[PDB]
From a paper:
ECF transporters consist of two identical or highly similar cytoplasmic ATPases, EcfA and EcfA′, and two transmembrane subunits, EcfT and the S-component. The membrane-embedded S-component serves as both the substrate-binding and the substrate-translocation domain. The other three subunits (EcfA, EcfA′ and EcfT) together form the ECF module that energizes substrate transport by the S-component. Here we report crystal structures of the group II ECF transporter for folate from Lactobacillus delbrueckii (L. delbrueckii) in the apo-state and in complex with the slowly hydrolysable ATP analogue AMP–PNP.
We determined crystal structures of the ECF–FolT2 complex from L. delbrueckii in the apo state (no nucleotides or folate) and in an AMP–PNP-bound state at 3.0 and 3.3 Å resolution, respectively. In both structures of ECF–FolT2, the ATPases EcfA and EcfA′ are in an open conformation with the subunits separated thus leaving the two ATP hydrolysis sites incomplete. The FolT2 proteins in the AMP–PNP-bound and apo complexes do not have folate bound. Nonetheless, the structure of substrate-free FolT2 is very similar to the structure of solitary, folate-bound FolT1 with root mean squared deviation values of 1.35 Å (FolT1 compared with FolT2 from the AMP–PNP-bound structure) and 1.25 Å (FolT1 compared with FolT2 from the apo structure). Although the structures of the apo and AMP–PNP-bound complexes are very similar overall, the relative orientation of the transmembrane and coupling domain of EcfT is different. The coupling domains of the two complexes are in identical positions relative to the two ATPases and FolT. In contrast, the transmembrane domains are in different orientations. In the AMP–PNP structure it is packed tightly against the FolT subunit and interacts with the loops L3 and the C terminus of H5, but in the apo structure it has hinged away and the two membrane proteins interact less tightly. The position of the L1 loop in the complexes is stabilized by a hydrogen bond between the backbone carbonyl group of G35 and the highly conserved R196 (the AMP–PNP structure) or N189 (in the apo structure) in the coupling domain of EcfT. The structural flexibility of the membrane domain of EcfT also suggests that the interactions with loop L3 and H5 from FolT are relatively weak, in contrast to the strong hydrophobic and van der Waals interactions between the rigid coupling domain of EcfT and FolT.
Author numbering:
A (entry chain D): 6 to 264
B (entry chain A): 1 to 280
C (entry chain B): 1 to 282
D (entry chain C): 9 to 173
């Protein structure tokens, strides 16, 4: 892990499909905005999405942190819009302007909006819930050669066994740290070697688990992917009308402000 | 009568192997309804028995050797229909845990049978209830103890309704708390479904409580006797590389102290009563 | 002359002593060459505590005097290596530790880089591979080519070949046949007799009674009971109120009491049980 | 190979390992030199290029979902990580162990995807010139890839035939 926690339990956070669609529809709705009332509209909806769904404001810093100073430079670069073309002149041409300032503030809100809607996608949903949604969006390509039975299987196992192989590594790490071992001493020719004492155990293990699982899967009567039911499915709850309204209302507001 | 009969079997690993057969002889039979123990030293080849039973492993010849889980004979396309009669609980619960949550692991077997979902809901919730895992139905294998993930491993088996439950090395990694708890549950699950159980190598109550005990050292079957029979085998059992259960060990140490007790005590109750008797 | 924890708490985050998180309080002291069992319900923190010994974790409150060092919440990472030659942890399922392409290179790995020479790293790996009971042709013989049992040996020889003052073992005998545990628990019982403290982390209460000089008990990160196996298993109600298991002989003794045979003293062990069954008739 | 199962579990197994090895960068002292190429080399060598490529794409998906990425999700971002194991697989699949194979396979991965495509996905949505994101890229990609060939070729080569036979 990896994060974040599904609610403890907070209100909403239901039906990853609709919320993931709302996540994808919103980042498309982040684009297609030509006015200051456009950026006003898309700002106070994604905003209203956040604290009506109530999360502590401090949890959003974790997503913004890595991209901050580069994106400041983006917004700093485009706050200077000057001489886009026809001036390869003059002296110091670049200068502060409101046109750039409002451009630079556009890019802050245009960029930061994708780290709001998407952050609440991860925070408010289990990883399997997202995967369940992901495989549903993936479905319509069944018409092509792509069988998706094994694609959904490989995903389901990796998502399942990523936690375990992690915890097995720490155990292996501390194991070699006890009889050995120092991992940080300086060198190129030197400390590439330190990877092996964790890796071979982890790879030996990961082979040992692929053995034990493939055997159990068949002793549970796994013939193949073809045509055997499903236990775990997704519903459509009553709460799912909120994101259809929230998405459909904002549509017209964004339409007016685009044009 | 017997619920499965394995004929003369020679099985090796020929890739990579053949200094030695793993078994080369065997030819044993389990009586229907009976709890049975396959016990031996590692290298007696018992570990490979349970996999040859459901067809995952195969004899060398396929002709002179015959494996039938009674009603059905291994195997060509027979294999899959055999696995409807028999299922196995392996030793490492985390490794074989196939479900996202608890109730997806108990539904996995049903899924493979194309049982439609409305019926799957009622069979799964019933199976996790039978193993005590009701409250934990939606919990995760990562967050479950080592004895809890073998209750889910067994619960996934009750959902496909096996005739034979082979415990292969299950409780290997486990505390003696959970070991008696798991076995006590299988004992219940056994006599409410009228099954045949094949348990492998925990000794103690897993063997001393079984109706039939097969000593597999080494590669071949050493005697066949009941638990009250072969555990008194002492040296011929001890020179095998094995050991003896508590009551057999406690009556042993008592003899050297001058207390001679009848060689049929399979229990604490018989021994407690025998010491209650012998105290006048 | 002891292994002393005062006054040792461990928290997984910022904390204050009111919280029950991790380890809390924990004032105790352990004798020189004793065989100390460490028992408790899963999630008591016996695992966390184990990691404090070699300072894979450092406390957030107290002090630890163990090998002659002193481990304080501010303790840095210098000189960890001279501590871990003296104090060795062996984790549950140490056959995963095997990495090296040869058994003898995998056992040498421990003594080597711990400040052994080459002459005395082979000398020790050869010493402790025969000492842990492998055939000598299994030297070389890449350790992944070995049975589950003999990998456990390689692991053990890997961590014992530099012969630490203290050795800490989480469930070392887990998953081994009944005669295997006897071999293992004797090798440690022999290693103790050589003047070395031995830590044993197990949920099996049978060989705690047989093999241990005194036991520590943890419930929710607090140390509830420190005493010898007898003083620990005396109480019927206190032992059962916490979730804790008698050794078998203690249950058969109490089982004779259900029949009323009046076994003298506290047997705890099959020889002690048979002798007090022989005494109790007479 | 029809009826592939038990090759596919290990496939997910290396999808896992690669997802794990993407978060871990060690690394020397000052220059972090992230891991996770190993997972793509592993997907490359023993699974093959047209297979590993499918894995490296799922290794964004699983990774993006769990740790709350980033990642993709968004489609042209996974193509980079899908492409990675392919090119390692292209000349290492059912192919011998040789020093000519890796140097072509390490430095190239940088240039094609790690340089060009990673540079591209940076400069597309913004006004930052492609040559600005190209500038920063050339440094990092003229230093570290030579550190991979040291660990890529030798560490893989044993594991290539250690577990193969």
């Amino acid at each position: 892990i990896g994060r974040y926690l599904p609610g403890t339990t907070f209100v909403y956070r239901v039906d990853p499909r609709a919320k993931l669609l709302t996540t994808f529809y919103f980042i498309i709705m982040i684009f297609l905005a030509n006015n200051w009332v456009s950026y006003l509209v898309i700002s106070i909806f994604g905003l209203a999405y956040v604290f009506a769904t109530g999360l502590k404001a401090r949890v959003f810093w974790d997503g913004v942190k890595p991209m901050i100073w580069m994106i400041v430079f983006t917004s700093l670069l485009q706050t200077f819009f000057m001489a886009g073309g026809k001036v390869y002149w003059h002296w110091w041409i670049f200068t502060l302007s409101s046109e750039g300032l409002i451009n630079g503030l556009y890019v802050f809100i245009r960029f930061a909006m994708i780290i709001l809607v998407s952050t609440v996608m991860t925070v408010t949903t289990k990883p399997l819930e997202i995967a369940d949604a992901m495989e549903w969006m993936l479905t319509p390509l069944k018409l092509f050669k792509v069988n998706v039975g094994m694609i959904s299987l490989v995903i389901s196992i990796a998502l399942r066994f990523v936690p375990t192989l992690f915890d097995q590594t720490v155990k292996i790490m501390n194991a070699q740290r006890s009889r050995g071992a120092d991992f940080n001493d300086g060198g190129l020719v030197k400390r590439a070697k330190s990877v092996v004492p964790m890796l071979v155990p982890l790879f030996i293990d990961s082979l040992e688990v692929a053995l034990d699982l493939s055997t159990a899967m068949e002793s549970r009567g796994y013939k193949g992917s073809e045509g055997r039911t499903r236990y775990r499915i997704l519903e459509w709850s009553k709460v799912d009308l909120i994101p259809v309204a929230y998405c459909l209302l904002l549509t017209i507001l964004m339409i007016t402000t685009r044009k | 009568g017997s619920d499965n009969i394995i004929s003369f079997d020679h099985v090796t690993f020929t890739y990579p192997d053949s200094p030695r057969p793993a078994l080369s002889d065997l030819s044993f039979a389990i009586e229907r309804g009976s709890w049975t123990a396959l016990i031996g030293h590692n290298g007696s080849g018992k570990s490979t028995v349970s996999k040859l039973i459901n067809g995952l492993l195969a004899p060398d010849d396929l002709d002179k050797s015959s494996i039938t889980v009674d009603g059905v004979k291994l195997g060509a396309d027979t294999v899959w229909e055999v696995r409807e009669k028999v299922g196995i609980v392996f030793q490492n619960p985390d490794n074989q845990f196939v479900g996202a949550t608890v109730s997806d692991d108990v539904a996995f077997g049903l899924e493979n049978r194309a049982v439609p979902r409305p019926e799957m809901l009622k069979i799964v919730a019933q199976a996790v209830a039978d193993v005590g895992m009701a409250d934990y139905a939606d919990s995760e294998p990562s967050n479950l103890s080592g004895g809890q993930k073998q209750r889910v491993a067994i619960a996934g088996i009750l959902a496909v309704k096996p005739q034979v439950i082979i415990l292969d090395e299950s409780t290997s990694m486990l505390d003696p708390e959970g070991k008696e708890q798991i076995l006590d549950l299988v004992r219940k699950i056994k006599e409410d479904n009228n099954l045949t159980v094949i348990s492998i190598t925990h000794d103690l109550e897993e063997a001393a409580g079984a109706d039939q005990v097969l000593v597999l050292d080494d590669g071949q079957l050493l005697d066949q006797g009941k638990p009250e029979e072969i555990f008194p085998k002492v040296e011929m059992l001890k020179r095998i590389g094995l050991d003896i259960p508590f009551v057999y060990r406690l009556k042993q140490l008592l003899k050297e102290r001058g207390i001679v007790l009848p060689d049929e005590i399979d229990d604490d109750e018989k021994l407690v009563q025998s010491l209650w008797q012998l105290n006048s | 002359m002891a292994i002393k924890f005062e006054n040792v708490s461990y928290v997984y985050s910022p904390g204050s002593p009111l919280e029950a998180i991790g380890l809390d309080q924990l004032n105790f002291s352990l004798e020189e060459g004793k065989f100390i069992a460490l028992v408790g319900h899963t999630g008591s923190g016996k695992s966390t505590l184990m990691q404090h010994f070699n300072a894979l974790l450092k406390p957030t409150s107290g002090k630890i005097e163990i090998a002659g060092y002193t481990i304080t919440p501010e303790t840095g990472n210098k000189g960890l290596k001279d501590l871990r030659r003296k104090v060795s942890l062996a984790f549950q399922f140490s056959e995963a530790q095997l990495f090296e392409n040869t058994v003898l290179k995998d056992v040498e790995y421990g003594p080597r880089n711990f400040g052994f020479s080459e002459d005395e790293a082979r000398e020790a790996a050869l010493k402790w591979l025969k000492k842990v009971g492998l055939k000598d042709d299994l030297i070389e013989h890449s350790p992944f080519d070995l049975s589950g049992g003999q990998m456990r040996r390689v692991a053990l020889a890997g961590v014992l070949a530099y012969e630490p003052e203290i050795i800490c073992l989480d469930e070392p005998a887990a998953g081994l046949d009944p005669m295997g545990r006897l071999e293992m628990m004797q090798l440690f019982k022999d290693y103790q007799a050589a003047g070395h403290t031995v830590i044993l982390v197990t949920h099996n209460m049978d060989d705690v009674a047989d093999y241990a000089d005194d036991v520590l008990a943890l419930e929710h990160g607090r140390l509830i009971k420190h005493a010898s196996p007898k003083e620990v298993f005396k109480d019927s109600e206190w032992l059962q109120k916490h979730h804790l298991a008698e050794p078998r002989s203690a249950r058969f003794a109490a089982k004779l009491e259900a029949a009323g045979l009046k076994l003298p003293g506290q047997p705890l062990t099959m020889p002690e049980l048979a002798d007090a069954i022989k005494q109790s008739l007479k | 190979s029809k009826l592939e199962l038990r090759e596919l579990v290990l496939l997910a197994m290396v999808i896992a390992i690669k997802v794990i090895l993407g978060q871990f960068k060690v690394g020397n002292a000052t220059l972090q030199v992230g891991l996770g190429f190993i997972g793509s080399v592993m997907l490359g060598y023993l699974f093959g290029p047209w297979w590993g490529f499918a894995g490296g794409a799922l290794s964004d998906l699983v990774s993006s979902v769990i740790f709350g990425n980033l990642g993709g999700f968004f489609i042209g971002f996974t193509l980079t990580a899908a492409l990675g194991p392919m090119i390692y697989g292209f000349f290492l699949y059912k192919q011998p162990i040789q020093i000519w194979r890796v140097i072509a396979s390490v430095i190239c991965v940088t240039v094609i995807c790690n340089i060009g495509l990673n540079t591209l996905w940076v400069s597309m949505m913004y006004g930052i010139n492609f040559m600005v994101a190209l500038s920063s890229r050339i440094l990092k990609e003229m230093i570290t890839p030579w550190i991979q060939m040291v660990a890529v070729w030798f560490i893989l080569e044993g594991l290539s035939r250690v577990k193969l036979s």
